[PDB]
Specification:
By secondary structure, the chain is α+β, with helices and mostly antiparallel strands. The protein is built from 14 helices and 23 strands. The chain binds a molecule of 4 linked components (BGC-BGC-BGC-BGC). The site of a molecule of 4 linked components (BGC-BGC-BGC-BGC) has 5 residues, from α7 and α12. Belongs to the AcsC/BcsC family.
């Protein structure tokens, strides 16, 4: 056909991006409707709405209600966001016929996004058995993958898993249908030479299988920080047990921790008496509580998915001060920028006084204080398409309050630019720059009565240069890196006992005469973090991680070991990076 030669002439111009214009000047003579539909599809692939509707009018001027044009109109209306117009256009579709599986799949998808699940289910129940009998190809693989996704969204995960297992035969991942979970996970592994459809099938099948599994983890981590014995010589142990069970689209988790806080003993020298900046010992010598240690247990329950997450729990029961923490989060995408808002209630685990609170010596006052809880909101912005760049930012503001402590509030701001030197599937090395600015209304770093004993700089500014190295193989997954930082702090002079209602009347004048001097300091800091994970058998995984914090921010170091149990059995690609259990207080 003469028109066929014209069409292929334009098809030999797709190398240049201006082939649409060339078709436009070529079709200045009456083009009938076949080339019009071809250029309408071309316009649909590149940009939408405006010219798509222009071509809609051009075809509809002299068309006998073509099914493809109307279907494209439905798709455009769904993209535009007009439910009524899209539904009307879908109803305008002609009666069902042979309708080669592609157009049926598009109509079923449009019905799925148009609130017609009661008809989309029937459409896909008719589409899948016929596609199964066909030999392996692209369209059959696409329709099988879309049916598996629809069944996953429908509610039944078993049918989606079966469809995903079958889809590999049509796509070309495997010649024979898998009959066991181990082969399924092994075929979900990534390959450096795969088509887009094959990559998508592997990714979504692996994600669905990981979501639909039972995991049990046990982790014990040793954390602490050097300091003066009695209130700051922190040496703490925590044991956490977590079980992740699938539920609807997301995963439900149950976490239970067991802490053991040991801060040492007072270095008494004045004949069984000590006079340190803790409690009210500087007004009168303290005696009786030479050893300071505590332990407790906590329970956490929550549910999360891709869109929004929430959790609820309590602070470790057994401590001097106990409170009910909580949190919630939401995530979405705006263009190329992703934002994750959240409102959280978290305690401070930097010290025993901040976390569970201490008790003053029975000789002087014998009163309980501490237990700082931060209730605030935060806004985080992320942007990453993942070729040679990455930028993230975050801002949060809390209201630091606690039992028998002075009220305080903070406004933190974190930002960072990370550059991926290697962007391989199994290897990722990132070098970038980090910036952090914090501001606290009141300096409560002292451990005296009325203060929270937590790092609260009035003005903070830190610049860090982190270097990362993420790599994985068949059985090993490790991460090694370091980050040197330069920080500048500036505190202000505050009275030693901001809240004067607890101190005795006799010591009131001397208490007022005592104040905590403020100062400014700057210096270089560094931090080193390493991770390791090894898959021993198909069900049990073991790993460990070491965190070293020397950034002058009084952050304690962390050394953790954990073992993960998988009920189903995962023989697929390892986690990049390995994912240890973050402590509940650190959330
Ligand atoms: O065929 C009609 C059918 O089309 C559907 O839309 C399809 C497009 O037809 C199809 O060209 C497109 O495939 C893209 C794919 O989106 C890209 O991801 C891919 O680029 C890959 C690359 O192949 C990989 O090697 C590499 O690793 O990653 C990049 C991407 O990161 O390139 C191909 C071709 O350009 O996918 C669309 C979605 O299916 C319509 O949805 C449907 O209505 C029509 O019936």
């Amino acid at each position: 056909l003469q028109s066929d030669q014209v069409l292929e002439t334009a098809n030999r111009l797709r190398e240049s991006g201006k082939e649409a214009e060339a078709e436009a000047m070529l079709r200045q003579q009456p083009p009938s409707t076949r080339i019009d539909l071809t250029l309408a599809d071309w316009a649909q692939q590149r940009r939408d709405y405006t010219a798509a509707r222009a071509a809609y009018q051009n075809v509809l001027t002299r068309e006998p209600a073509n099914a493809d044009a109307i279907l494209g109109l439905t798709e455009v209306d769904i993209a535009a966001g007009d439910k009524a117009a899209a539904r009307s256009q879908l109803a305008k579709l002609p009666a069902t016929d042979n309708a080669s599986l592609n157009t049926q799949r598009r109509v079923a998808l449009a019905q799925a996004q148009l609130g017609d699940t009661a008809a989309a289910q029937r459409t896909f129940n008719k589409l899948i058995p016929q596609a199964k009998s066909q030999p392996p190809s692209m369209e059959s693989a696409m329709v099988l993958r879309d049916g598996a996704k629809f069944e996953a969204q429908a509610g039944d995960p078993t049918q989606a898993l079966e469809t995903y297992k079958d889809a590999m035969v049509a796509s070309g991942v495997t010649t024979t249908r898998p009959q066991d979970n181990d082969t399924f996970t092994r075929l979900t592994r990534n390959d450096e030479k795969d088509d887009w459809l094959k990559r998508g099938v592997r990714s979504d099948a692996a994600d669905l299988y990981r979501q639909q599994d039972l995991n049990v983890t046990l982790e014990h981590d040793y954390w602490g920080s050097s300091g003066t014995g009695g209130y700051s010589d922190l040496k703490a142990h925590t044991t956490m047990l977590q079980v992740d069970a699938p539920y609807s689209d997301g995963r439900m988790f149950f976490r239970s921790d067991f802490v053991n806080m040991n801060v040492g003993s007072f270095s008494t020298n004045a004949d069984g008496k000590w006079d340190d900046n803790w409690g009210t010992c500087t007004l009168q010598d303290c005696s009786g509580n030479r050893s300071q240690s505590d332990s407790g247990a906590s329970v956490a329950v929550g549910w999360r998915n891709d869109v929004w997450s929430w959790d609820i729990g309590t602070t470790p029961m057994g401590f001097n001060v106990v409170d009910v923490v909580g949190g919630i989060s939401y995530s979405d995408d705006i263009g190329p920028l992703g934002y994750t808002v959240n409102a959280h209630r978290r305690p401070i685990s930097s010290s025993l006084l901040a976390f569970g609170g201490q008790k003053d010596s029975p000789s002087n006052t014998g009163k309980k204080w501490g237990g700082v809880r931060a209730d605030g909101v935060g806004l985080s912005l992320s942007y990453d398409k993942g070729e040679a760049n990455g930028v993230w930012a975050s801002l949060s503001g809390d209201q630091l309050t606690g039992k028998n402590v002075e009220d305080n509030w903070r406004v933190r701001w974190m930002t960072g630019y990370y550059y991926k030197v290697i962007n391989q599937n199994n290897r990722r090395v990132t070098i970038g720059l980090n910036n952090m600015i914090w501001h606290y209304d009141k300096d409560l770093s002292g451990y005296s009565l009325g203060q929270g004993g937590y790092y609260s700089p009035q003005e903070y500014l830190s610049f860090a240069i982190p270097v990362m190295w993420r790599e994985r193989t068949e059985n090993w997954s490790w991460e090694l890196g370091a980050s040197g930082s330069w920080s500048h702090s500036r505190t202000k002079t505050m009275p030693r006992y901001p809240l004067m209602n607890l101190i005795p009347t006799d010591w009131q004048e001397e208490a007022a005469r005592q104040s905590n001097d403020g100062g400014s300091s700057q210096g270089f800091g560094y931090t080193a973090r390493a991770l390791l994970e090894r898959r021993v058998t198909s069900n049990w995984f073991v790993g460990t991680a070491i965190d070293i914090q020397q950034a002058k921010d009084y952050a304690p170091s962390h050394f953790l070991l954990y073992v993960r149990y998988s009920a189903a059995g995962w023989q697929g690609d390892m986690d990049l990076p390995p994912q240890p259990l973050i402590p509940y207080a650190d959330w």
